[PDB]
Amino acid sequence: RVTFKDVGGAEEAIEELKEVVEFLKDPSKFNRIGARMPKGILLVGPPGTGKTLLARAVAGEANVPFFHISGSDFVGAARVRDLFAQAKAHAPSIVFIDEIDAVGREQTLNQLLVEMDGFDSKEGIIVMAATNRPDILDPALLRPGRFDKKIVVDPPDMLGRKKILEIHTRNKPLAEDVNLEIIAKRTPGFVGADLENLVNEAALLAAREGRDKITMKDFEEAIDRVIAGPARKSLLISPAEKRIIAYHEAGHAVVSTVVPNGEPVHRISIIPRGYKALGYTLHLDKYLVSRNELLDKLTALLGGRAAEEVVFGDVTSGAANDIERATEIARNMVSQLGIDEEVKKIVTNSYERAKEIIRKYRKQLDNIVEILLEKETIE
Amino acid sequence: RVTFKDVGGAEEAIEELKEVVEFLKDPSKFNRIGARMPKGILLVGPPGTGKTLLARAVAGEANVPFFHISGSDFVGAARVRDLFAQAKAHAPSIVFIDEIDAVGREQTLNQLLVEMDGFDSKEGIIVMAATNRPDILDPALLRPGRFDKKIVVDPPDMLGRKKILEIHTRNKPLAEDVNLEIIAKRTPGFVGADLENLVNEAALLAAREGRDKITMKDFEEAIDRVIAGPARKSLLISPAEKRIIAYHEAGHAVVSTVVPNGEPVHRISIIPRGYKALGYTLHLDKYLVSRNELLDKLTALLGGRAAEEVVFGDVTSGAANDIERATEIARNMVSQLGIDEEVKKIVTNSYERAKEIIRKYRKQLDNIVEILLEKETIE
Numbered sequence: 195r196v197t198f199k200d201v202g203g204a205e206e207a208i209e210e211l212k213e214v215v216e217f218l219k220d221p222s223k224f225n226r227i228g229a230r231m232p233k234g235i236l237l238v239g240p241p242g243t244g245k246t247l248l249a250r251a252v253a254g255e256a257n258v259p260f261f262h263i264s265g266s267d268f269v270g271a272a273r274v275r276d277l278f279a280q281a282k283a284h285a286p287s288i289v290f291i292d293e294i295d296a297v298g299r300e301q302t303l304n305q306l307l308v309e310m311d312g313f314d315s316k317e318g319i320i321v322m323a324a325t326n327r328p329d330i331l332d333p334a335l336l337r338p339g340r341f342d343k344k345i346v347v348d349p350p351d352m353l354g355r356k357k358i359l360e361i362h363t364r365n366k367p368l369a370e371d372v373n374l375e376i377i378a379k380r381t382p383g384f385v386g387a388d389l390e391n392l393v394n395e396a397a398l399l400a401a402r403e404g405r406d407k408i409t410m411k412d413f414e415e416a417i418d419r420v421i422a423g424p425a426r427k428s429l430l431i432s433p434a435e436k437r438i439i440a441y442h443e444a445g446h447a448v449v450s451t452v453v454p455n456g457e458p459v460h461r462i463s464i465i466p467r468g469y470k471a472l473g474y475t476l477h478l479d480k481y482l483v484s485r486n487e488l489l490d491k492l493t494a495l496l497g498g499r500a501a502e503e504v505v506f507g508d509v510t511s512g513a514a515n516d517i518e519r520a521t522e523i524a525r526n527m528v529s530q531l532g533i534d535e536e537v538k539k540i541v542t543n544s545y546e547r548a549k550e551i552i553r554k555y556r557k558q559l560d561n562i563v564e565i566l567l568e569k570e571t572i573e
Numbered sequence: 574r575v576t577f578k579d580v581g582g583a584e585e586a587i588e589e590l591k592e593v594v595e596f597l598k599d600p601s602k603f604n605r606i607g608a609r610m611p612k613g614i615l616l617v618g619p620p621g622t623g624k625t626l627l628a629r630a631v632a633g634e635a636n637v638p639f640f641h642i643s644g645s646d647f648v649g650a651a652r653v654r655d656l657f658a659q660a661k662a663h664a665p666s667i668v669f670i671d672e673i674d675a676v677g678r679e680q681t682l683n684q685l686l687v688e689m690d691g692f693d694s695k696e697g698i699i700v701m702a703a704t705n706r707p708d709i710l711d712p713a714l715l716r717p718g719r720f721d722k723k724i725v726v727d728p729p730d731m732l733g734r735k736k737i738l739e740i741h742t743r744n745k746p747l748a749e750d751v752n753l754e755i756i757a758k759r760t761p762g763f764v765g766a767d768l769e770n771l772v773n774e775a776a777l778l779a780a781r782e783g784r785d786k787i788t789m790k791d792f793e794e795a796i797d798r799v800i801a802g803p804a805r806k807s808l809l810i811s812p813a814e815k816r817i818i819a820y821h822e823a824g825h826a827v828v829s830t831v832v833p834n835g836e837p838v839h840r841i842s843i844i845p846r847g848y849k850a851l852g853y854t855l856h857l858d859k860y861l862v863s864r865n866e867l868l869d870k871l872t873a874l875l876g877g878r879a880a881e882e883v884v885f886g887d888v889t890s891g892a893a894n895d896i897e898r899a900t901e902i903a904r905n906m907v908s909q910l911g912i913d914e915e916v917k918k919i920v921t922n923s924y925e926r927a928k929e930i931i932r933k934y935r936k937q938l939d940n941i942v943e944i945l946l947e948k949e950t951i952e
């Protein structure tokens with residue numbers, strides 16, 4: 195059994211799931227005012243971030259049964275029928291499906307669509323699913339009445355990493371020299387699964403010497419064992435890679451602040467945070483289409499690639515993704531505001547414009563990077 | 574009965590196995606702090622290096638029973654069931670499987686997976702296996718909870734060879750002119766099995782003449798008998814082959830030291846040492862993907878092949894493996910940083926770059942080779 199006290203660094207996701215817990219505890223409070231709940235909910239995120247753990251914590255905060263199946267184990271149609279019948283017989287309950295992209299071969303998909311349409315939501319039944327490849331899902335699953343809510347689960351930041359370390363050492367004896375805050379600052383790029391495996395390695399080092407406490411030296415030696423060798427499990431960002439990433443992020447922020455139609459900036463960080471930063475389209479944005487605001491959007495989207503070329507003379511894979519998105523936007527501009535030769539010159543002009551802004555504001559760009567290299571995030 | 578005193582030239586491997594010996598002597602010391610041990614361990618290395626001997630030495634350092642089976646002898650499912658039942662009845666024990674690649678026909682594999690999931694590790698039970706073809710194993714065996722630790726066993730160097738000769742002559746009478754250090758310098762490329770057979774041949778030469786001691790002349794004549802003829806058993810590196818190998822290894826080191834993104838060099842040797850140098854992938858590496866560091870990695874990987882062509886005008890099988898790896902890296906570069914014609918020119922440009930570095934630093938390359946030809950290793 196787990197609850198929300200076993201989860202670290204997922205404040206925004208836990209905020210959205212509070213509604214589900216209340217509904218499962220007393221459906222009648224929603225029915226008496228005509229509030230209609232979605233039938234399915236989708237969790238999307240990178241592997242190891244805790245999508246399966248979040249679902250189990252929902253069923254713990256409300257004492258309801260938990261019926262689950264795994265999509266990687268896929269007779270198929272018969273198994274889906276059995277699972278939904280169990281949930282109906284016990285009215286307020288949960289149905290959970292894992293690796294839904296594996297199963298969502300044509301008979302199994304058809305049966306699932308029949309089951310979603312055939313149960314009554316007012317009883318207190320809800321369906322949940324998880325995936326890390328949302329862009330290959332069948333469009334029939336996402337139509338209204340089937341799966342119309344999405345929640346994004348993100349990698350942790352420095353304060354999120356420190357919380358997870360505390361959760362997994364509360365049943366272990368520690369020495370007085372252990373500083374979990376220093377350990378958190380040395381593991382950027384780790385996820386919750388990586389941090390849980392790191393605590394086990396430090397305990398093996400202490401046990402192999404017969405000691406009954408874990409010291410600060412055990413933790414530091416465990417970091418080197420998990421990132422190198424024939425049996426390695428994790429990747430972290432080195433100090434050299436950190437400097438290049440900081441210049442890329444600060445390049446976006448400076449160009450947006452200078453163009454008149456650019457959007458305001460609220461946060462800069464070394465760790466990705468949104469669904470766009472994670473590389474998802476989610477099968478998905480202005481009422482009015484204008485030339486001046488479309489050109490300002492293109493220039494700011496090439497700000498990260500321009501700072502790399504002016505400062506280092508290099509190019510990363512994130513900058514190559516940015517250039518591909520810009521070409522798609524320009525192609526739609528030509529067909530709406532009044533062909534390949536025309537698209538090519540629009541992108542080239544925007545790139546030159548961004549490079550001049552980077553040269554003229556080089557001093558401010560350097561100042562931002564220095565603060566980022568010590569704090570990792572500016573709110 | 575054998576212990577760690579019967580093993581030579583395996584210091585790093587013996588270091589990793591100290592944890593297993595402590596666990597088998599008293600499991601409760603691991604349980605009281607929540608340290609969780611792996612269920613299976615894999616030993617990988619070339620034939621004759623002592624993988625079966627290392628496993629038997631673990632069961633000697635800790636007085637526990639030793640149950641073993643051989644994979645080349647494969648009713649199959651029934652034999653696997655019997656072996657695991659014996660180990661459970663005697664709680665702290667060892668299960669050893671040899672030639673696991675032969676057995677890992679579909680019924681026997683399924684039974685093994687059932688047994689691995691059905692025993693309790695906290696009792697003090699552990700499973701070990703060995704192979705020299707790790708890349709053909711079924712991926713189901715390597716999933717978490719089954720076989721998640723790997724240890725590499727390497728061929729011996731000059732000081733490792735001298736130790737093995739001492740182990741196998743401690744019960745034999747030697748003359749005063751025998752110098753085991755000179756014998757070690759004359760057998761590069763031998764493994765422990767070859768060295769153990771060489772001592773027996775020298776004893777037969779002495780016994781055939783009625784003598785009661787083994788002289789230095791007996792050892793020198795035994796070398797020629799085991800490497801040639803209708804009954805030959807061993808291969809060694811000749812002085813002509815030694816010179817070509819030294820230039821190949823020094824070519825990698827010089828190119829890495831000159832490119833800005835190359836990695837530091839800690840050791841150069843005539844004998845292979847790592848799992849990459851032995852030709853294994855092990856079913857397995859940077860957080861950030863960048864163009865400048867990917868090109869520097871390609872250039873250094875072709876350094877050995879470039880020194881062969883500039884100095885001798887030849888090509889070996891190791892250089893042909895290097896060219897195949899480079900083509901795989903370049904192919905992934907084209908699809909991530911922005912087809913066959915494009916891949917071909919990336920590899921050709923990197924090869925030309927390495928050849929110019931070799932010509933410009935020819936003097937330093939010659940100096941390193943001379944030291945290597947006398948010491949065999951530079952730490």
Ligand SMILES: Nc1ncnc2c1ncn2[C@@H]1O[C@H](COP(=O)(O)OP(=O)(O)OP(=O)(O)O)[C@@H](O)[C@H]1O
Pocket residue numbers: 200201202203204240241242243244245246247248326358361385386387390
């Ligand atoms: N925020 C977290 N707090 C604590 N533990 C976490 C957290 N995130 C992940 N873990 C650990 O991760 C381990 C496995 O991750 P989990 O299965 O929950 O994630 P996932 O996103 O569903 O992964 P996968 O893609 O592998 O299925 C769990 O044992 C849990 O201990």
Ligand SMILES: Nc1ncnc2c1ncn2[C@@H]1O[C@H](COP(=O)(O)OP(=O)(O)OP(=O)(O)O)[C@@H](O)[C@H]1O
Pocket residue numbers: 579580581582583619620621622623624625626627705737740764765766769
């Ligand atoms: N490091 C060593 N020290 C001493 N003897 C060794 C060493 N390595 C191998 N031997 C000798 O090798 C002989 C056989 O090798 P062993 O079976 O232990 O190796 P292996 O890697 O399991 O071989 P194979 O692939 O043939 O099964 C043993 O009798 C042992 O005498």
Ligand SMILES: [Mg+2]
Pocket residue numbers: 246
């Ligand atoms: Mg999981």
Ligand SMILES: [Mg+2]
Pocket residue numbers: 625
């Ligand atoms: Mg053997």
Ligand SMILES: [Zn+2]
Pocket residue numbers: 442446498499512513516
């Ligand atoms: Zn960018």
Ligand SMILES: [Zn+2]
Pocket residue numbers: 821825877878891892895
């Ligand atoms: Zn090479």
